[PDB]
Design an enzyme around this catalytic site. Structure first.
Site, PDB file in Angstrom:
ATOM      1  N   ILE A   1      52.130  65.932  56.163  1.00  0.00           N
ATOM      2  CA  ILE A   1      51.991  67.345  56.501  1.00  0.00           C
ATOM      3  C   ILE A   1      50.523  67.739  56.516  1.00  0.00           C
ATOM      4  CG2 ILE A   1      52.386  69.669  55.624  1.00  0.00           C
ATOM      5  CD1 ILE A   1      55.178  68.685  54.716  1.00  0.00           C
ATOM      6  N   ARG A   2      49.758  67.252  55.543  1.00  0.00           N
ATOM      7  CA  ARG A   2      48.347  67.608  55.458  1.00  0.00           C
ATOM      8  C   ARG A   2      47.586  67.154  56.697  1.00  0.00           C
ATOM      9  NH1 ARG A   2      49.552  67.137  49.472  1.00  0.00           N
ATOM     10  NH2 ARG A   2      49.616  64.847  49.482  1.00  0.00           N
TER      11      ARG A   2
ATOM     12  N   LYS B   1      37.171  60.270  54.630  1.00  0.00           N
ATOM     13  CA  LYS B   1      37.538  59.206  55.552  1.00  0.00           C
ATOM     14  C   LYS B   1      36.390  59.002  56.529  1.00  0.00           C
ATOM     15  CE  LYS B   1      41.202  60.614  57.869  1.00  0.00           C
ATOM     16  NZ  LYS B   1      42.314  60.449  58.835  1.00  0.00           N
TER      17      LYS B   1
ATOM     18  N   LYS C   1      45.036  51.167  58.887  1.00  0.00           N
ATOM     19  CA  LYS C   1      45.321  51.901  60.110  1.00  0.00           C
ATOM     20  C   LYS C   1      44.079  52.127  60.963  1.00  0.00           C
ATOM     21  CE  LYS C   1      49.510  53.660  58.650  1.00  0.00           C
ATOM     22  NZ  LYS C   1      49.542  53.402  57.178  1.00  0.00           N
TER      23      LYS C   1
ATOM     24  N   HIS D   1      40.714  52.936  59.902  1.00  0.00           N
ATOM     25  CA  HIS D   1      39.592  53.719  59.414  1.00  0.00           C
ATOM     26  C   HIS D   1      39.425  53.522  57.914  1.00  0.00           C
ATOM     27  CE1 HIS D   1      43.056  56.471  58.904  1.00  0.00           C
ATOM     28  NE2 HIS D   1      42.413  56.871  57.821  1.00  0.00           N
TER      29      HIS D   1
ATOM     30  N   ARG E   1      38.704  54.791  53.963  1.00  0.00           N
ATOM     31  CA  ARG E   1      39.081  55.855  53.040  1.00  0.00           C
ATOM     32  C   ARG E   1      38.167  55.774  51.827  1.00  0.00           C
ATOM     33  NH1 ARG E   1      45.231  57.309  54.281  1.00  0.00           N
ATOM     34  NH2 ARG E   1      45.473  56.017  56.156  1.00  0.00           N
TER      35      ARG E   1
END
Lengths: 310, 310, 310, 310, 310, 310
Positions: free
Chosen positions: A108-109, A188, A223, A225, A227
């Protein structure tokens, strides 16, 4: 964070499925309803406010006795719901798939951040429906493409390179489902293009991360990238990625994992994840996380130091 | 920051000099006065509000057209003035000395911090007039003793050891003479006792400084404690300490300089200051500051890291 | 501004008259009372709140339908009343005089300023009851002495000399009887001592008045100090001083008038007032006010100018 | 105050250069970017928010560590940028010139004032695009015309004549780049028409300036209007105008200087500037500034005085 | 909620141990300290602010990264600490016992409530030091006596009988350690005297509990009073009481349990606890909790109903 | 609550009566008017603000001396008036009927709730003019249809079933005519459809009402839905329904009364109302209300209890 069915329901009109956002008073009515166990997975008819999500997702919604859900009565819930509906409506989803599509759990974020991007006249997503769709389809798990800078979820840019864009995730200030722990900090680093990156542009990023974020581990979830997470949290990140790797193997879903540049990733994280991709067990992988090691770009931290002294 | 004469004036009663705080309306009257060049160094009679500082110190006081002075109309000005008077009144200063004592320049921010310490019932200085006097006499330049933790100017404790107490200087929030640059951050590390410090207690301090303050240089001004300043400021610190070393040589005043532990001090600062003590020129000393070098406690930063990952 | 009887009443106890402040609810009761014409000049018994001023002074008190009086319900009314009572009580006034003493009209704003002086620990009047009494007796018209800096009504000091203290009158901010016209600005210059003033100290004052108050006329009311009033108001000042000079002649009361230094006073005001002291008529005196003339310390304004350019 | 390139960038479409305002998030991204020394003078691609100014102009923008720039995140930055773009877009600038046009330094405060003029329905500039363009082109340094009342930057009118309009500069209240020194006061007097001015209309202006602005020097920078600045600032004005005169000579750019009416200009400023136009050195010119002299409209100050006394 | 050592430390003066409250800045210093594993259970010397609790109790104190502790910087922490010290100081504790006394875990919320009782002039505890000591010693686990109404922790009285006093626990509004779950509601019913209670007075209490608290279970923890808790929480209560019963058996500490009136206690709770006292296992006891049963004062709910209808 | 004539007046245009809302200033003018007894029942011409209600309805409007009316100056008065006009305008009312239609007394609170429903985009009434008209005509007493969930007045949904929707009446927060007693709480349960309801769906409703609303009596006014009112109010409800039953008999108006499900209605209310329908007197009916009786779904309250304990 929540299944897509928490935001919209499917409506078959014209031999194709259109997806429609929930009214929040329909959700509210649902939360007060007595429902048979057999109907917990069916969409709920509030009668006065339209259709509502299956009562089985009750815990996704914040109430007097639940704080681990979303604030479905805010404006952001509707904006996020419409963003999902627009993306899913461009897909002409077929009858066999609607169940799988809606049951999919998404961040959701990530979706609230894409809303924030698209509503900003300064942002490219405000002006390109194609980029917005691409960006949303990535966050909905309905695209094979990799999230890059162009299609990033967003946030505050804190560093930028020819090759990289570093963002600060503003989850503490979200309206729909903010992070509640006020100690939360996460960044990120997305790639600007997909052509090879020079050593000097890698150096520049590594140098910034050691000077300005020395208390943060450089990891990835595979995925595409980076973090930037505090060391006090990498163990929890490891659990989640492994559980996700394990599950995606059992279910046959796509399970490729991009370890990314070993000159950038924290060496313990590279070890942990490389052991994962080799099929090792959790206990074997996680051990490489806590195992001390020390065999990088030497003397990069002392370069930035002297630059500042001048 | 200001000469002692900016806060009090001497009064000969009973063959001894008592020092009296200025009323702030007396200062205000002085700032509006027409004074002969011959009287600029004499204390000023405001007639209505008592005596005032010599008009030659006009720039020490903030006005509509001066922001580089102090806020002499605040309550803190009076508290600081009384703290000075109490300390100076215990010294029975003699007629030949009053001029030298008052003309001495002291750190106002150090004095405001000592006020904050003594007014706090939790602080030892609240309960020992002897320690307060000692602490103040150090800040007034009327004591040979070295500032330690017990007699520290104060601030917020952010780290403490058997051997060290690290304080954050709160100068941004001061009332009398705050630092105006909102980017200001400075810490100091005071010694708890004066008996030798074990390697393990040094290690503990160095480890904290590399993890939590990696963007800060560990330096000293030679007065027996460490100063934790951002690298963007060490060059200015170097200028000030050298000018102070140079002057104290020309004037014959005490000029011993404690370089402190070379395992703790930033190696460039140790080089810079060791060249100073050897009598070298500014240009020779300052060159060792910007000269890159790399020959410490190896692997201490990776210890704290793994501790956090657990 | 008001007769002394507006603040206190006389009480004969022990063959001597003590003066007592009014309760403000006693005044309020009086303002609502039906009183015979024969009793309008007698003190009024409110029964519940003690004695009150003679109903003939009704217009001295602000009400729903009067704004040209005082705010007798404020704390300042009581402080002013007590200040009057203290001064008048030190005089052991006798039975024949009480009427004359109370019927005397005084400046309320002068009395509120003396209150402000005495309540301030920084002010000499706070610490000397003798100076306060002297200062008050001057403002009450019960002293032959001249108001000097020491005994000034007060205000904000804006310029000070070896010989002079210039004050800004803060009447706009008074509580008891403020000036209501927000355009009001008035200063006074009091003498620090009564021994002769050098030409250089006069020069310094004149220079400040031409640079910083070029739009203000330097006049006096003859009571031993200068009044710095805007030119748009000197004509009204002239009327008042003449009416006061005329009356004091008809009534035989003291009528000496100190024209003060002709090098300082506005030349037209000196002419106007010198014609007064010679017994001329209002129309003859006032003509010299508006009569242009030009025959001073040459080049004093250009001195301050160049000082500023440096 | 800033080069035009701080607000817009050139875009070649249709064999002509159109100028486009920066998004403020593009500027923000630029400020965080690592850029090669070779690219510091090139416009920066923020990727997400469009193009940004060359990183070499970093100091023109206010940040946590810079207060001497502009507040580029305010609405006024965008309005000013659009005003520049509109003016520059009417010029069909050619490929050889864009560099010179953008590199030109202009007064931001002048541009913010023109915005304030044009957005006001009461102001002629709101209703005439031609006058606005003319007015802006003057402030952009892309016009040979002289700023008059019609095309004035604006402010609060405080005096007006058949021949003159006196304005108060409101720089303290600006949003984009306000003056930070709260003691700042500056006026300008613009000419209403360019036909000769009678002696009586000059008299009227001089009279107002001596009565209401006696503490201000009447100077000019040679651009066809008067500047009313406090004497405490003329020396700094002298430095700036000379440096501008000196530079414009070395670079061959237009360097005519209108000394304006010697009956109005401060005589020392006339001397200083007349020496400039004669080619003298800074030290020779500046000496005439501090050199006292006294050889004007006699008795004009005493006219306004008596008018007020009536 | 916390060991007594979290609030005070022992000081041997005069062959007896006096207990002293911690300064909160001493606690704060401790929380920032590097401490050997061997010293984690020793009281900590903050040097500047006195002694502090053993670093092993770090988690009892709320910090940026801990919300499950107490707010030790509030005034209530000091009041609670002083209340403990007063009670413990009346006991002349001996050297062998201090460790056991301080290591004892007590209810902070009970202690904050006793503070609230004693500071209220209306409350009997304000006026009887003996009752306050008795009441505190009960809450400190240093008394054999049973908490009754007189010595109750307190709260808002919501029902009272000849035999009972029902209180609402205000833990949501506590300052030191409030309950954070805003859905929390809990009452307690204390006995006014210890002589037998008539059937009619039991009836009255049962009737109120069924009408006004029908959604609450009547249970006890065996300490001599009733606890009115929502049914959604009895299972957690059962776990805690059993763990406490189990532990107190293993450690030999006092382990009597008063099941209280079976006409009042929820029948499932009576079954659960009676099985406990018989030595059964947790799984056997807890089963009687969830086991439905139905075999009370018949028709008491319909009495209150009809009373209301009238 | 008020006759329809309190909101609108009839206007014959085009052989049909259109109804027009009152301006609130017209009402205000009316309230100040002197009117003949013969005209008290005629609409009033305010001259300046149009027509106003007959002065005989003066007490329906809140004033300085009336709080038992409506707040006719709020926006809600106009919205309610327009809602009435729209409904009545769809009826083409004829000349013989207008009097009866307007003289009809309706529930204002019901009408304000329908406004709240229709203005909400989430509510079906916002999107169906036909349902809104139906719903309003029911509340206006111009429809034979029964209020169901679809056409409910509204409120906050607190429980919902396949067969029932329970609403909380928000009358305390109304703007037009709120309930003034802050202790007011009332719910209603409307039927979702009009086909038979299973025993299990009745059980579910009864179970919720005993657990969550044990202090509330389940009654009806005979109009086809349940009313959940506190027992302290049923006697007043009984009076009102009987008076309404009695009147509707004397006037011949429709007087059918739906006693609804005897398994749901409070047994005393069923008795009271069944005696009404049999033609008994008030005293005979009301006696069955207070008469205790006890002869339902056994053990339904203990089901919900154990569910919560889990």
């Amino acid at each position: 964070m929540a299944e897509l069915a928490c935001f919209c329901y499917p409506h078959l009109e014209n031999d194709s499925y259109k997806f429609i956002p929930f009214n929040n008073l329909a959700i509210k009515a649902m939360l007060t309803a007595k429902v048979d166990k057999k109907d917990m997975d069916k969409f709920y008819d509030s009668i006065i406010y339209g259709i509502a999500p299956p009562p089985q997702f009750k815990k996704r919604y914040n109430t007097n006795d639940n704080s681990r859900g979303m604030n479905f009565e805010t404006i952001m819930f509707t904006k996020v719901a419409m963003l999902i509906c627009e993306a899913l409506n461009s897909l002409k989803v077929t009858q066999a798939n609607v169940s799988n599509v809606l049951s999919r759990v998404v961040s959701i974020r990530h979706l609230e951040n894409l809303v924030i991007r698209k509503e900003n006249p300064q942002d490219i997503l405000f002006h390109s429906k194609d980029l917005l769709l691409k960006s949303t389809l990535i966050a909905i798990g309905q695209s094979k493409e990799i999230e890059t800078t162009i299609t990033a979820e967003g946030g505050e840019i804190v560093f930028q390179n020819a090759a990289f864009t570093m963002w600060k995730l503003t989850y503490l200030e979200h309206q729909l489902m903010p992070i509640l722990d006020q100690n939360f900090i996460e960044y990120k680093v997305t790639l600007n293009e997909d052509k090879p990156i020079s050593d000097v542009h890698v150096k520049e990023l590594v140098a910034e991360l050691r000077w300005q974020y020395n208390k943060f581990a450089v990891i990835t979830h595979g995925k595409g990238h980076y973090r930037i997470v505090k060391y006090s949290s990498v163990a929890n990140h490891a659990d989640r990625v492994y559980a996700t790797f394990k599950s995606n193997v059992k279910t046959g879903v796509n399970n490729d994992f991009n370890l990314l540049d070993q000159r950038i990733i924290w060496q313990n994280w590279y070890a942990f994840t490389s052991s994962m991709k080799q099929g090792n067990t959790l206990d074997v992988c996680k051990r490489l996380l806590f195992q001390k090691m020390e065999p990088p770009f030497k003397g990069l931290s002392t370069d930035r130091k002297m630059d500042e002294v001048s």
